[PDB]
Amino acid sequence: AESTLGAAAAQSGRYFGTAIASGKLGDSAYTTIASREFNMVTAENEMKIDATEPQRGQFNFSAGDRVYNWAVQNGKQVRGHTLAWHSQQPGWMQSLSGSTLRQAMIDHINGVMGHYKGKIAQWDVVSHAFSDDGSGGRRDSNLQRTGNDWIEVAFRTARAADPAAKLCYNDYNIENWTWAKTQGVYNMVRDFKQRGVPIDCVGFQSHFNSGSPYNSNFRTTLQNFAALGVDVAITELDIQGASSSTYAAVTNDCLAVSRCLGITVWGVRDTDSWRSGDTPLLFNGDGSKKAAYTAVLNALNGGGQIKGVGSGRCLDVPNASTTDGTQVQLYDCHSATNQQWTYTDAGELRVYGDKCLDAAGTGNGTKVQIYSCWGGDNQKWRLNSDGSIVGVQSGLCLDAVGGGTANGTLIQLYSCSNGSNQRWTRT
């Protein structure tokens, strides 16, 4: 299969997952997308410490099991998240320290893993353990103050609790190889493998944005860690702006690393994101696939003028007009700026540099024209592998009116049909 993300990833033995929030499982639009596109699930918050052990010694798995059950019943594996870390600790744990905190950490690991023993593919045993101060050292926390060996102990405890689960160390800002934080974690994992500390994977959260941007060296980081003898996983992927190129780049980085188990994006729709303002996911709030979705799917499936297949003519702005509202047409291909389209990372098809291929509405017959670029979804398009070009907002295909092939044939939106008047080639 190759029409959905999970299935496409499965072609190479990998998974494509998402973060599931129990409070959204009653939302049909949400579950329809989530069940269809992903074959791996991480509970966004339901398996954290405060959620699983609200009171010291009092475990509660109602929320966690709801997410776990939904996952398995819908054919998805599960990544446990998270057994031991400084954030979101229940009140009682926040006030603990020293030996008592160390034992509390151990009891928690045993309780949660015991409950899910043998049913979890991967567990984020420890997360957010390193600082962002640039020293590459451990971050100051109550857990770290119990002893620098707390992480090692967590892993040994986890291995004994459930030998069937892959144990991962998870963190953010450890994707760029040149960063001190990345080196700090690398050195720790290397030390662990050399001394026999039970660690099977390293999770790279991959929360990319202009403050901490994706860099091509992420692939090198993944390869360097894989060379240590551990699997790697992209665990909480989201990209500020959802650039199609960046999303495809990260996807290809995992495909380039034999031990990269798969990729999990942190949420289903942008409206479900912990950082919705960065519109960092693959689906819009209205459920429509973003340009980045198609870029990722194309990558998972193994991978200028825009010429119509049925007509042999090019997408053309009549008389090189730059006027907003000018409907586009088919016209004999020739060297002219009004036939030069640029596909951007935002999914736009630009002409003249700042004009955008624009749908004047959402239904069949809608006029496709040029309008100054502003970022609307009616100006975003998905370039499908079959040659069709689909509008993000409308879900409709660019269509040469009535199957016309002569110069002057207008372009409109129309239900996709795989017809030759809806197929295009670029060069």
Side-chain angles (χ1 to χ4, degrees):
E2 33 178 298
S3 64
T4 58
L5 304 175
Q11 290 173 132
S12 68
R14 296 182 174 77
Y15 61 75
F16 205 95
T18 188
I20 290 292
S22 60
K24 301 184 179 70
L25 291 180
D27 183 335
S28 178
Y30 178 85
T31 57
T32 290
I33 299 171
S35 184
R36 179 189 73 228
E37 306 289 344
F38 308 105
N39 49 22
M40 246 289 209
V41 166
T42 300
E44 184 170 23
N45 290 289
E46 299 76 4
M47 289 187 187
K48 291 179 177 180
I49 307 178
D50 64 325
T52 54
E53 207 188 322
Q55 288 78 57
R56 193 173 188 293
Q58 303 301 296
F59 293 101
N60 186 298
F61 300 105
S62 185
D65 290 353
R66 185 158 56 263
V67 174
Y68 168 79
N69 291 324
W70 183 85
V72 178
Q73 294 293 355
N74 285 88
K76 297 106 180 62
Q77 289 189 280
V78 174
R79 297 195 72 261
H81 182 76
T82 292
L83 298 173
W85 65 316
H86 77 291
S87 185
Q88 311 188 195
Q89 303 183 308
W92 61 271
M93 187 182 280
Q94 297 180 55
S95 61
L96 300 180
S97 61
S99 59
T100 185
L101 172 57
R102 177 61 69 79
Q103 186 59 56
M105 176 189 87
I106 293 177
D107 297 323
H108 185 74
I109 294 174
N110 292 319
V112 179
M113 291 189 88
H115 182 73
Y116 295 108
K117 190 175 184 181
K119 304 172 182 174
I120 306 301
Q122 298 170 48
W123 263 109
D124 282 329
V125 181
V126 176
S127 187
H128 302 59
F130 284 66
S131 176
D132 298 304
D133 59 44
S135 67
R138 302 294 188 70
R139 79 158 60 198
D140 176 52
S141 69
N142 64 319
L143 289 169
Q144 180 57 51
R145 295 185 299 84
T146 68
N148 190 68
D149 68 312
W150 72 278
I151 299 178
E152 188 186 321
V153 175
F155 277 93
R156 289 181 179 292
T157 300
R159 174 69 91 225
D162 186 358
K166 283 186 178 176
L167 310 179
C168 313
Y169 171 72
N170 188 56
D171 215 331
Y172 63 97
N173 285 358
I174 54 165
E175 298 79 16
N176 190 313
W177 184 251
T178 66
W179 287 36
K181 192 177 184 184
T182 307
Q183 294 304 302
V185 177
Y186 176 75
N187 295 318
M188 174 182 76
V189 182
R190 180 170 58 180
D191 174 53
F192 279 13
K193 301 304 294 180
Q194 298 182 308
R195 297 191 293 94
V197 180
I199 180 170
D200 313 299
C201 40
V202 177
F204 299 78
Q205 296 182 196
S206 303
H207 288 300
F208 301 120
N209 53 47
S210 78
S212 300
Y214 162 82
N215 187 283
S216 61
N217 68 28
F218 178 37
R219 184 182 298 193
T220 313
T221 297
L222 295 178
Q223 285 163 155
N224 287 341
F225 274 86
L228 292 180
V230 298
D231 296 324
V232 296
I234 296 176
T235 61
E236 304 175 22
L237 178 67
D238 47 33
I239 299 165
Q240 177 187 58
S243 159
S244 294
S245 290
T246 309
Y247 252 115
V250 173
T251 298
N252 284 320
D253 287 336
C254 186
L255 290 174
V257 180
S258 190
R259 299 188 71 157
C260 179
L261 308 178
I263 301 174
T264 290
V265 286
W266 210 235
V268 182
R269 303 163 299 188
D270 282 339
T271 49
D272 307 311
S273 180
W274 68 314
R275 294 185 174 173
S276 63
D278 283 337
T279 61
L281 295 169
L282 302 170
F283 288 85
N284 291 129
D286 64 7
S288 59
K289 291 167 177 177
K290 299 168 69 174
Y293 172 94
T294 301
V296 173
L297 186 66
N298 168 253
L300 292 170
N301 281 320
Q305 301 176 307
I306 296 182
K307 186 175 64 179
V309 173
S311 66
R313 292 189 162 74
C314 286
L315 189 58
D316 176 296
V317 184
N319 304 304
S321 174
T322 64
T323 303
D324 290 332
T326 300
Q327 180 163 18
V328 294
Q329 70 183 348
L330 287 181
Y331 201 84
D332 298 319
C333 304
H334 68 289
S335 188
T337 62
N338 60 311
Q339 289 193 354
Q340 288 289 73
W341 303 88
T342 299
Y343 191 54
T344 68
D345 282 317
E348 309 156 306
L349 278 175
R350 292 186 174 232
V351 61
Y352 307 131
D354 206 39
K355 290 292 176 173
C356 272
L357 190 66
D358 180 295
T362 55
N364 289 323
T366 290
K367 164 186 178 178
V368 175
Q369 69 209 337
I370 54 167
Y371 190 82
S372 281
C373 301
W374 65 279
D377 286 347
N378 59 306
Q379 300 194 319
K380 290 176 178 170
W381 312 84
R382 304 196 301 265
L383 310 181
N384 294 319
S385 57
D386 71 354
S388 63
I389 297 175
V390 187
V392 171
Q393 182 186 71
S394 71
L396 299 183
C397 277
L398 281 186
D399 179 291
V401 178
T405 56
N407 287 320
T409 298
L410 302 176
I411 305 302
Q412 75 187 333
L413 285 186
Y414 208 97
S415 56
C416 301
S417 64
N418 301 307
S420 67
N421 68 316
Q422 289 192 0
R423 290 205 298 281
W424 317 82
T425 58
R426 39 190 171 66
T427 304

